[PDB]
UniProtKB/Swiss-Prot annotation, chain A:
<dbReference type="InterPro" id="IPR019775">
    <property type="entry name" value="WD40_repeat_CS"/>
</dbReference>
<feature type="repeat" description="WD 1">
    <location>
        <begin position="10"/>
        <end position="53"/>
    </location>
</feature>
<dbReference type="GO" id="GO:0005829">
    <property type="term" value="C:cytosol"/>
</dbReference>
<dbReference type="GO" id="GO:0016593">
    <property type="term" value="C:Cdc73/Paf1 complex"/>
</dbReference>
<dbReference type="InterPro" id="IPR051510">
    <property type="entry name" value="SKI8"/>
</dbReference>
<dbReference type="InterPro" id="IPR015943">
    <property type="entry name" value="WD40/YVTN_repeat-like_dom_sf"/>
</dbReference>
<feature type="repeat" description="WD 2">
    <location>
        <begin position="58"/>
        <end position="97"/>
    </location>
</feature>
<feature type="repeat" description="WD 6">
    <location>
        <begin position="226"/>
        <end position="265"/>
    </location>
</feature>
<dbReference type="InterPro" id="IPR020472">
    <property type="entry name" value="G-protein_beta_WD-40_rep"/>
</dbReference>
UniProtKB/Swiss-Prot annotation, chain B:
<comment type="subunit">
    <text>(Microbial infection) The PAF1 complex interacts with Zika virus French Polynesia 10087PF/2013 non-structural protein 5/NS5. The interaction with viral NS5 proteins may reduce the antiviral immune response by inhibiting the recruitment of the PAF1 complex to interferon-stimulated genes, thus preventing their transcription.</text>
</comment>
<feature type="repeat" description="TPR 13">
    <location>
        <begin position="220"/>
        <end position="253"/>
    </location>
</feature>
<feature type="repeat" description="TPR 10">
    <location>
        <begin position="104"/>
        <end position="137"/>
    </location>
</feature>
<feature type="repeat" description="TPR 9">
    <location>
        <begin position="58"/>
        <end position="91"/>
    </location>
</feature>
<feature type="repeat" description="TPR 15">
    <location>
        <begin position="288"/>
        <end position="321"/>
    </location>
</feature>
<feature type="repeat" description="TPR 12">
    <location>
        <begin position="173"/>
        <end position="205"/>
    </location>
</feature>
<feature type="repeat" description="TPR 16">
    <location>
        <begin position="324"/>
        <end position="357"/>
    </location>
</feature>
<feature type="repeat" description="TPR 14">
    <location>
        <begin position="254"/>
        <end position="287"/>
    </location>
</feature>
<comment type="function">
    <text>Component of the PAF1 complex (PAF1C) which has multiple functions during transcription by RNA polymerase II and is implicated in regulation of development and maintenance of embryonic stem cell pluripotency. PAF1C associates with RNA polymerase II through interaction with POLR2A CTD non-phosphorylated and 'Ser-2'- and 'Ser-5'-phosphorylated forms and is involved in transcriptional elongation, acting both independently and synergistically with TCEA1 and in cooperation with the DSIF complex and HTATSF1. PAF1C is required for transcription of Hox and Wnt target genes.</text>
</comment>
Length: 300, 450, 148
């Protein structure tokens, strides 16, 4: 565990999000980043270094979230102007633009089959758009406040939604039914994700903890003492061995959940780290933050 | 204690192996001094380990552990606390420690480290062990209540404060914690009740928090539209009198001087209050209230550059933690004179908060930033930035659709149609200038061919 | 009033390459508020100073709050409210050089004012927004004050 390569001046402004695929369908070499300078940049990771593939210029405000399809070589990005843009990563061209305005659109997530695109809104609902046309197929109403984070299971079973008042909602994506409502957080939850077998939900919230819930019977599976500050992004390695976390205290930590011990802590960022993701092979960690850098950490 | 430190320096100048003098210096530092005693924490330490090789008493190990906890060497401090239980035999191994002083105070100290490192389970276990050794020491219950409050469970913190009050009814610390919990929830009635319960016997640095909270509850209504009615009752003169009575006793608590400066700033005496903001500025640092008061004084004086520099210093020394409302307080001071000629870089800074937050609140300020872009797009007549700014103007009108739901809607309802009607011919002006520049570049290419 | 610069500085170091003159020493110091650098020549005999000490500078254009900009002439007797009465160490000089981070196209981000108080040199090195009112060949007063 160490730093393999640092890409300085990857953006002229702060980087808010990063995404990396899981399968070998031309997203296990592709970085997609969204930054403050209104750009979406696609990078090619190959031959132990990071190279620029596309500079996609369609947004007029800062990109708050990027995500890559795990079934198609396409990406989607959402920005603060509530304009969602789908990018074809084989020509670097704009597929479609969903004007979900005026401000009512937020962080995106692809389903593993890449049929549905989930996002949260200011009403307190989870809108489910069709990826095939960019039209809202349905909505999920779990009333309350603003949904900050949403995440699919990587086997096509459940959808998880995290709100700003700490409300987690677990949905069946075959009928649209609300299955579970979890409240162990009075604080905003800025990142959550399901395990690569859909057994664990690891939630990163603005309280200094990393909390693990079982989403098969809706109880507290455990509490990992995370950082001393707001944990901003958690991500599983796609073989379910370790998971990485990043926080606003300028720290990245790789956690072994079987012994509940931190195996390595990276201080290479001198700014708040907003995005982390594992490699599709699981041997690399990509991380971005407010330091204008894309850090690649190696894994054995 | 000045003469005591002089006698200690004389004893250290007459013999460098004074174990009693080093123990006295370590105790006098651990009880009072933090800033200056730390190098003396070296001075007692380096000889004292030379004593610790000779014999392992729990007092010297506990003093080294407390000195390491106060210096910030939490690892060696925890190691000395563990050595006080494992290597100091006199604590509980084959002897008895008076009042449970040796272990349980150690059971406090590393447990406070358990508070520090987010080791909540170990700190809870240490507090439970301290409670099991003796049912008293309500301060461990107060630390448990503060830990429960840090989790977002202030009801559990209030319950732990009630358990501490069950340990000791006349305890100003638990009453101050309940008063702060009420004041955080806007509970000035219960806060005044807790201050009356505290103020029966107590005073002097445990009542001055209550006077400061009364002045703060007056200032909280001074910053609101009810301040006219409070202006009818003259609450500011009462707050000024309370601040004068608090400042007559204290000489190192700069919060009372900052409150008096704020109370002077809220009236017409602000030109002197900034000078009070000078005096607290002459005081010690690591206080965001002083920089915030200087920024507020600059914003009241319309000197936005110095207020922006003070806000930048406050964010540089405080932005590590929950200060996500200070960016909006920085951005609010850029439109206090109808100013829109200094909100060009503010357009990226005001929307630069994080990838996880709400943006419905400050939309008005966002409109007041985009209007500044709507100032520049009419002046610059170069194409490939005009029509993009017109699209951003339509986006600003979509934010005006939320700004309507109040005379700012009456202003921007004129400005929307006015800026669209200006853009109607300004885009044709921009395309005309594009044609003229292409004519010029074609003429230059023709000259090069010639 | 007229105040060119106003800050609290803290002696990070005293004259590093030994001392060259036996009465006056080049002290180096940083800033808390504005985070800029100062190099300054004070004489040690009438105004001693140690490492780690902390003091406040008011670089000003005149010694009067009225803002009159009187002379370069020395009158021992003047019954006027002076700015120097509040301060311990006071000098007087002319700023002779301004150096910048500028280039051909862009403006300057950082500035470096160099001023000689009768032979005693000073470099004030910060950013162009704070080093604003300094103009070359302008007379200037120093106004130090030592604070505990």
């Amino acid at each position: 565990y160490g730093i393999l390569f640092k890409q300085e001046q990857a953006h002229d402004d702060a980087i808010w999000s990063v995404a990396w695929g899981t399968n070998k369908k031309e997203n296990s070499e592709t970085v997609v980043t969204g930054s403050l300078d209104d750009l979406v940049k696609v990078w090619k990771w190959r031959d132990e270094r990071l190279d620029l593939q596309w500079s996609l210029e369609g947004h007029q405000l800062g990109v708050v979230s990027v995500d890559i399809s795990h079934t198609l070589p396409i990406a989607a990005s959402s920005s603060l102007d509530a304009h969602i843009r789908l990018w074809d990563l084989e020509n670097g061209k704009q597929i479609k633009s969903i004007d979900a305005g005026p401000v009512d659109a937020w962080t995106l997530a692809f389903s593993p089959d890449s049929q549905y695109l989930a996002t949260g809104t200011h009403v307190g609902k989870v809108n489910i758009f069709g990826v095939e046309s960019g039209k809202k197929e349905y909505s999920l109403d779990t009333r309350g406040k603003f949904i900050l984070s949403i995440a699919y299971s990587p086997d096509g079973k459940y959808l998880a939604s995290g709100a700003i008042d700490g409300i987690i909602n677990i949905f069946d994506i075959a009928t649209g039914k609300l299955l579970h409502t979890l409240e162990g957080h009075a604080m905003p939850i800025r990142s959550l994700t399901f395990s690569p077998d859909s057994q664990l939900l690891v939630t990163a919230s603005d309280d200094g903890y990393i909390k693990i819930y079982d989403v098969q019977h809706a109880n507290l599976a455990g509490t990992l003492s995370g950082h001393a500050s707001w944990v901003l992004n958690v991500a599983f390695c796609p073989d379910d061995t370790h998971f990485v976390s990043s926080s606003s205290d300028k720290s990245v930590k790789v956690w072994d959940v079987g012994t509940r011990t931190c195996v390595h802590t990276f201080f290479d960022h001198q700014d708040q780290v907003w995005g982390v993701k594992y490699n599709g092979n699981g041997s690399k960690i990509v991380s971005v933050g407010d330091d204008q850098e894309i850090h690649i950490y190696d894994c054995p | 204690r000045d003469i005591a430190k002089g006698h200690l320096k004389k004893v250290t100048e007459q013999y460098p192996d004074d174990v009693e003098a080093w123990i006295e210096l370590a105790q006098i530092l651990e009880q009072t001094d933090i800033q200056g005693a730390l190098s003396a924490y070296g001075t007692a330490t380096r000889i004292l380990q030379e004593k610790v090789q000779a014999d392992v008493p729990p007092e010297i190990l506990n003093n080294v552990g407390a000195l390491h906890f106060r210096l910030g060497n939490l690892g060696e401090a925890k190691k000395y606390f563990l050595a006080s239980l494992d290597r100091a035999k006199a604590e509980a191994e084959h002897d008895e420690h008076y009042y449970n002083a040796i272990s349980v105070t150690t059971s406090y100290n590393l447990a406070r480290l358990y508070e520090a490192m987010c080791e909540f389970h170990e700190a809870e276990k240490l507090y439970k062990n301290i409670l099991r050794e003796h049912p008293n020491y309500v301060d461990c219950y107060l630390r448990l209540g503060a830990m429960a409050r840090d989790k977002g469970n202030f009801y559990e913190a209030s319950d732990w404060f009630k358990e501490a009050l069950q340990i000791n009814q006349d305890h100003p610390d638990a009453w101050s914690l309940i008063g702060n919990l009420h004041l955080a929830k806007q509970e000035w009635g219960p806060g005044q009740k807790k201050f009356e319960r505290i103020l029966k016997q107590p005073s002097t640095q445990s009542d001055t928090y209550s006077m400061l909270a009364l002045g703060n509850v007056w200032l909280q209504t001074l910053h609101q539209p009810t301040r006219d009615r409070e202006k009818e009752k003259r609450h500011q003169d009462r707050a000024l009198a309370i601040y004068k009575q608090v400042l007559r006793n204290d000489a190192k608590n700069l919060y009372a001087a900052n409150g008096i400066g704020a109370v002077l700033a809220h009236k017409g005496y602000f030109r002197e209050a900034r000078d009070v903001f000078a005096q607290v500025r002459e005081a010690t640092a690591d206080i965001s209230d002083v920089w915030l008061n200087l920024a507020h004084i600059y914003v009241e004086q319309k000197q936005y550059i110095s207020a922006v520099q003070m806000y930048e210093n406050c964010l540089r020394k405080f932005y590590k933690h929950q200060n996500t409302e200070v960016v909006l307080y920085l951005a609010r001071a850029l439109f206090k004179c109808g100013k829109l000629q200094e909100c060009k870089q503010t357009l990226l800074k005001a929307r630069h908060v994080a990838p996880s937050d709400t943006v419905l609140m400050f939309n008005v300020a966002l409109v007041l930033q985009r209007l500044a872009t709507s100032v520049l797009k009419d002046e610059k007549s170069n194409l490939k930035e005009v029509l993009n700014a017109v699209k951003e103007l339509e986006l600003a009108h979509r934010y005006f659709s939320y700004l309507s739901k109040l005379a700012l809607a009456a202003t921007e309802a004129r400005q929307c149609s006015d800026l669209l009607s200006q853009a109607q011919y300004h885009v044709a002006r921009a395309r005309k200038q594009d044609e003229e520049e292409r004519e010029l570049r074609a003429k230059q290419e023709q000259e090069k061919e010639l | 009033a007229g105040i060119l610069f106003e800050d609290i500085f803290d002696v990070k170091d005293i004259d590093p390459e030994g001392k060259k003159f036996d009465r006056v020493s080049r002290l180096h110091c940083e800033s808390e508020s504005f985070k800029m650098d100062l190099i300054l020549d004070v004489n040690i005999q009438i105004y001693p100073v140690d490492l780690g000490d902390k003091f406040r500078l008011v670089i000003a254009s005149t010694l009067y709050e009225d803002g009159t900009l009187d002379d370069g002439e020395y009158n021992p007797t003047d019954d006027r409210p002076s700015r120097a009465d509040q301060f311990e160490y006071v000098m007087y000089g002319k700023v002779y050089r301004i150096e910048g981070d500028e280039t051909s196209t862009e403006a300057a981000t950082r500035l470096s004012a160099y001023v000689s108080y009768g032979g005693l040199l000073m470099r004030l090195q910060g950013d162009a927004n704070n080093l604003h009112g300094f103009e070359v060949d302008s007379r200037v007063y120093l106004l130090m004050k030592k604070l505990a």
